[PDB]
Amino acid sequence: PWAVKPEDKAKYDAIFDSLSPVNGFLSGDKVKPVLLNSKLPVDILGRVWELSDIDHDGMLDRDEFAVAMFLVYCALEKEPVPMSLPPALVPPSKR
Ligand SMILES: [Ca+2]
């Protein structure tokens, strides 16, 4: 299934709407700070975001911002983040 779970997409959809979503999008100006509070370096926010910004336009939609929350929260516990968007974390819209 999708690397993100329904319980994770629920906290991701709250964190996504905790930055002020725009018609279903968030500007790096909101997620950026939301990627730093993770205590991670800008390298993770540079890779995680990349694998999170399905569109890669400096913004994260509710589904793209979701991929950036579990990709970050995993770097705080112990799971680092690669730079290759895996097909298990990507939605059927990237197919
Ligand atoms: Ca986007």
Strand partners, 27: 59
Domains of the chain: 1-95 (1.10.238.10)
* CA distance readout (Å), 73 to 29, 36, 93: 19, 11, 24
Please tell me the number of Cα atoms within 13 Å of 66 on its side-chain side: 19
Residues 48 and 38: their CA atoms lie apart, in Å, by 12
Q: Give residue 61's Cα distance to chain centre.
A: 9
Task: For residue 26, give both structure tokens.
Answer: 């968030």
> How would you write 44-64 as a 3-class SS string?
HHHHHHHHHCCCCCCECCHHH
- Helix, strand or coil, per DSSP, at residue 91: coil
CA 85–ligand 1 middle distance (angstroms): 14
Question: Could you count the other beta carbons within 10 Å of the beta carbon of residue 34?
Answer: 20
Method: NMR
CA 77–ligand 1 middle distance (angstroms): 26
CA 40–ligand 1 middle distance (angstroms): 21
